[PDB]
Amino acid sequence: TVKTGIAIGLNKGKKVTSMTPAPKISYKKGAASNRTKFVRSLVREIAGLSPYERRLIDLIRNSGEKRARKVAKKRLGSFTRAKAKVEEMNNIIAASRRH
Amino acid sequence: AISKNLPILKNHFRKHWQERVKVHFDQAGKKVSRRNARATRAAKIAPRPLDLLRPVVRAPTVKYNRKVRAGRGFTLAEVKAAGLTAAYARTIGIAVDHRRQNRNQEIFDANVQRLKEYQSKIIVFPRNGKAPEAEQVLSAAATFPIAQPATDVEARAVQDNGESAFRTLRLARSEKKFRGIREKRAREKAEAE
Amino acid sequence: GAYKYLEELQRKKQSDVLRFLQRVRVWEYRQKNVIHRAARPTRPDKARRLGYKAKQGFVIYRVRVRRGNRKRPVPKGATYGKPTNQGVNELKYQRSLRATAEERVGRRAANLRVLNSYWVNQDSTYKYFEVILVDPQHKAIRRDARYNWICDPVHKHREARGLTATGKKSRGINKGHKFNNTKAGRRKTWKRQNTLSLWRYRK
Amino acid sequence: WRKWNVKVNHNEKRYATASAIAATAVASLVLARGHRVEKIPEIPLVVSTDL
Amino acid sequence: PSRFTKTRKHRGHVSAGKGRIGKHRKHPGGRGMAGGQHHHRINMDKYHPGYFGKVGMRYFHKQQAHFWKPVLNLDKLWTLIPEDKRDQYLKSASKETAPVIDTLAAGYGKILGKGRIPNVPVIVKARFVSKLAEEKIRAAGGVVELIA
RNA sequence: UUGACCUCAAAUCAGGUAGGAGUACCCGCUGAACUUAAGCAUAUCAAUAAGCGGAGGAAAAGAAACCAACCGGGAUUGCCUUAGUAACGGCGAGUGAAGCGGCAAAAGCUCAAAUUUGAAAUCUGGUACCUUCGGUGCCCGAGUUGUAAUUUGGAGAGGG
RNA sequence: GUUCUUUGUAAAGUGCCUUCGAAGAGUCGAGUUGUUUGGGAAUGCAGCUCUAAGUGGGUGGUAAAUUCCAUCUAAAGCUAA
RNA sequence: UUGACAUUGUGAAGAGACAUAGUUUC
Ligand SMILES: [Mg+2]
Ligand SMILES: [Mg+2]
Ligand SMILES: [Mg+2]
Ligand SMILES: [Mg+2]
Ligand SMILES: [Mg+2]
Ligand SMILES: [Mg+2]
Ligand SMILES: [Mg+2]
Ligand SMILES: [Mg+2]
Ligand SMILES: [Mg+2]
Ligand SMILES: [Mg+2]
Ligand SMILES: [Mg+2]
Ligand SMILES: [Mg+2]
Ligand SMILES: [Mg+2]
Ligand SMILES: [Mg+2]
Ligand SMILES: [Mg+2]
Ligand SMILES: [Mg+2]
Ligand SMILES: [Mg+2]
Ligand SMILES: [Mg+2]
Ligand SMILES: [Mg+2]
Ligand SMILES: [Mg+2]
Ligand SMILES: [Mg+2]
Ligand SMILES: [Mg+2]
Ligand SMILES: [Mg+2]
Ligand SMILES: [Mg+2]
Ligand SMILES: [Mg+2]
Ligand SMILES: [Mg+2]
Ligand SMILES: [Mg+2]
Ligand SMILES: [Mg+2]
Ligand SMILES: [Mg+2]
Ligand SMILES: [Mg+2]
Ligand SMILES: [Mg+2]
Ligand SMILES: [Mg+2]
Ligand SMILES: [Mg+2]
Ligand SMILES: [Mg+2]
Ligand SMILES: [Mg+2]
Ligand SMILES: [Mg+2]
Ligand SMILES: [Mg+2]
Ligand SMILES: [Mg+2]
Ligand SMILES: [Mg+2]
Ligand SMILES: [Mg+2]
Ligand SMILES: [Mg+2]
Ligand SMILES: [Mg+2]
Ligand SMILES: [Mg+2]
Ligand SMILES: [Mg+2]
Ligand SMILES: [Mg+2]
Ligand SMILES: [Mg+2]
Ligand SMILES: [Mg+2]
Secondary structure, X not given: OOOOOOOOOOOOOOOOOEOOOOOOHHHOOXXXXXXXXXXXXXHHHHHOOOHHHHHHHHHXXXXXXXXXXXXXXXXXXXXHHHHHHHHHHHHHHHHHHHO | OOOOOOOOOOOOOOOOHHHHEEEOOOHHHXXXXXXXXXXXXXXXXXXXXXXXXXXXEEOOHHHHOOOEEEOOOOOHHHHXXXXXXXXXXXXXXXXXXXXXXXXXXXXXXXXXXXXXXXXXXXXXXXXXXXXXXXXOOOOHHHHOOOOOOOOOOOEEOOOOOOOOOHHHHHHHHHHHHOHHHHHHHHHHOOOOO | OOXXXXXXXXXXXXXXXXXXXXXXXXXXXXXXOOEEXXXXXXXXXXXXXXXXXXXXXXXXXXXXXXXXXXXXXXXXHOOOOOHHHOOOOOXXXXXXXXXXXXXXXXXXXXXXXXXXXXXXXXXXXXXXXEEXXXXXXXXXXXXXXXXXXXXOHHHOOHHHHOOOHHHHHHOOOOOOOOOOOOOOOXXXXXXXXOOEEEOOOOO | OOOOOOOOOXXXXXXXXXXXXXXOOOHXXXXXXXXXXXXXXXXXXXXXXXX | OHHHOHHHHHOOOOOOXXXXXXXXXXXXXXXXXXXXXXXXXXXXXXXXXXXXXXXXXXXXXXXXXXXXXXXXXXXXXXXHOOHHHHHHHHOOOXXXXXXXXXXXXXXXXXXXXXXXXXXXXXXXXEOEEOHHHHHHHHOOOOEEXXXX
């Protein structure tokens, strides 16, 4: 950053010789891991797809990604998960029934 | 039920409020007990003081950051620089706060220095047995008063380059205000073919 | 270990392997009594992560609670009052099915202490639960510094007071701007904001 | 919850205690007050610290 | 105290000083602020014009603190220097050494310009300034240094 | 034929535990109307009374899926204040909290998810002895569908 | 304060290098109904339908798409004043 | 009372689309 040292404006605020702390591991609560990557990969090919997931990829191959998001947003919570879910499908497809 | 030129009141007394009246008839009582409590603790607590060493901290929000004020505990970094682990620092009557975070060196130094002064002015009786009687100072806080850092000098030369301060604020206000719009002209003019 | 596989597998409830499993088990349970002792967790990885332990002193109970809304008792729907209160049929119950389940085994094992409870299955009519319990008079438990807290009397019928996880959920106990009403404990924080504080030297 | 105690402004409270101290000299006042002080040396009456 | 009170005086007169005709009854006009728009409108418009209905913007979760910003006018300003020290600076009005006044440190957030300060140079440290304040300050050979 | 295991039973089986009471204060459920609005239905009374389940000497809450937007604070509880304010409201009668700041008190932590795998290292009980709120030996039993050690995000683990 | 057994070929703290770093699901979340709250395109709670991810997830008191930023680490648990 | 969703699974003929291979729907 660096603050401007005045009391309104863009990088508003008092100038302080600054420090940048050490990082909390509690900030990496999302991070993968080779262990969980491995497992999740494994479980998937055991249990396969699920009903709404089948409808997704077929909907992708037969109507495009935008119609898939729109559905998948309804199916899941929301547009952001739907984004992710469609992607995930796109990659079941590419990885498998392709290369 | 409305008359004269009176100010409109709002006395919220339409629930069974008489059932929830607290009179501190016990104000004098609690003071005593509070005091008795403290006298009893000072005893039990042997020569230790009644409180922990607390860090200096700049206060939050626009309204209070001119003031500095006792924080909770010292931060894993400050304790480290101060030459001790926190496991121990805790057994030595230093409060340590694993969630507070250093981002400001002035305060950081202040606190480490607070720990140095503390460490040097305390004395830690051996585990053993001997217990070499040494009498209690009751307040870590009284002993080591948190004070407001001096930010300038009383008097000093005048330097006027000319730029209105006022108009500087005006201008700064402005830049932020149109930061977004100008970024859209910057995008929109980049898309010129 | 296996437990990480169990965990992940169980997040695929609509998967072919899981819904076979689910349909069979839900038939079995419905044949058994509405409260019945369980031999063992059917979700060992779940139980485990909630406090379960394979030593004498831990009990598991399976229980059914009927689904749906709470039909307001009242004869013939008659409510006798203002119309805001004339409702009878979209009324929902503030505690949770899960909570009823803890409560009904709780009573069935008064000698026990409810620790926690997990969902296992449902159908149109019932939600099924496994409640994990502790025996506080069991010596295996009274020793063990980790669980003997449960042996204290302040934890008598924690399910009946909403002090189990479900209880604390519905009780609104969380930190933050979203929980002001319900957090120090709604009724208590109410009473607070409606107490009139008068000092000897009136302020 | 009737009001039993009463606030006086600290300063005025002093104005009074001060006043009352001032009238502990002023023999007429003392005399008029009960207080049998006709046959005392002088007023204020100051007695040895040894007391 | 009760002894000084007019009900003591009314004892023995029938109607407690509230009329034989029109009594003292429970709530004749209704309770509270009832009828504001009806039988109590003459008292409301006149005495409380403005009462009913709305103006401006709602502001959800307004935090007075955000807007903290006390004003100090030039009108004082020299007050924020201790007396002793003050007289010492008035005489010897000068660049090279002029007093520094942290007005934030005195807990004000804006200097405004009410009215005349002697020609002594001040160095004035503030979060905000009116145009005039900062003008009048320079006219004494001081400046405003913007802090935070 | 013999012996297991899983699951389910029985006993005046060996030892224990729950009930009821009290309920000022505490944790939940459930849940009014009189009343106020000068009428009245939303509102209000009130998340109140009555009904139900559950604790303790306090209960509950508690070491942040927090507050913030600052030069950032730092478990929870409570007092002073914020404030009759932001806000809600036939925007009517009415209602109505929070962050910051001062103060009382202070305190911190445990699991789950990990191969001990060169050695289930853990534990109920019976029993004989003892220096009996327990220890030791031995024997059934529990437990690998995981009892200990180890680690808890502030980290922390394995190698050097 | 005394005094007896040394618990150990036991246990714990710290510095550097390296490789790692497992972190709670019919939950979070969403729709809808109803209740509740100062909480306003919805403050909490519940029922039914849908139902996640791991550079993820929650919150950021005006709905939405886009792009960043800040800030914690839920769905398990104990604790005096 | 009427509809949708959930409880809800298995074959078969017939309609219906990527636009006359069979995943999917009545
Ligand atoms: Mg009141
Ligand atoms: Mg009333
Ligand atoms: Mg009292
Ligand atoms: Mg103290
Ligand atoms: Mg000793
Ligand atoms: Mg068993
Ligand atoms: Mg009724
Ligand atoms: Mg209603
Ligand atoms: Mg409220
Ligand atoms: Mg008064
Ligand atoms: Mg009076
Ligand atoms: Mg009198
Ligand atoms: Mg008289
Ligand atoms: Mg008279
Ligand atoms: Mg008379
Ligand atoms: Mg007369
Ligand atoms: Mg009169
Ligand atoms: Mg009369
Ligand atoms: Mg109004
Ligand atoms: Mg003035
Ligand atoms: Mg028997
Ligand atoms: Mg009872
Ligand atoms: Mg009610
Ligand atoms: Mg009444
Ligand atoms: Mg009325
Ligand atoms: Mg009337
Ligand atoms: Mg009427
Ligand atoms: Mg209501
Ligand atoms: Mg009652
Ligand atoms: Mg008792
Ligand atoms: Mg107490
Ligand atoms: Mg407690
Ligand atoms: Mg934590
Ligand atoms: Mg922070
Ligand atoms: Mg706090
Ligand atoms: Mg009003
Ligand atoms: Mg209310
Ligand atoms: Mg404070
Ligand atoms: Mg502790
Ligand atoms: Mg977690
Ligand atoms: Mg209700
Ligand atoms: Mg709602
Ligand atoms: Mg958004
Ligand atoms: Mg536990
Ligand atoms: Mg607790
Ligand atoms: Mg206790
Ligand atoms: Mg059925």
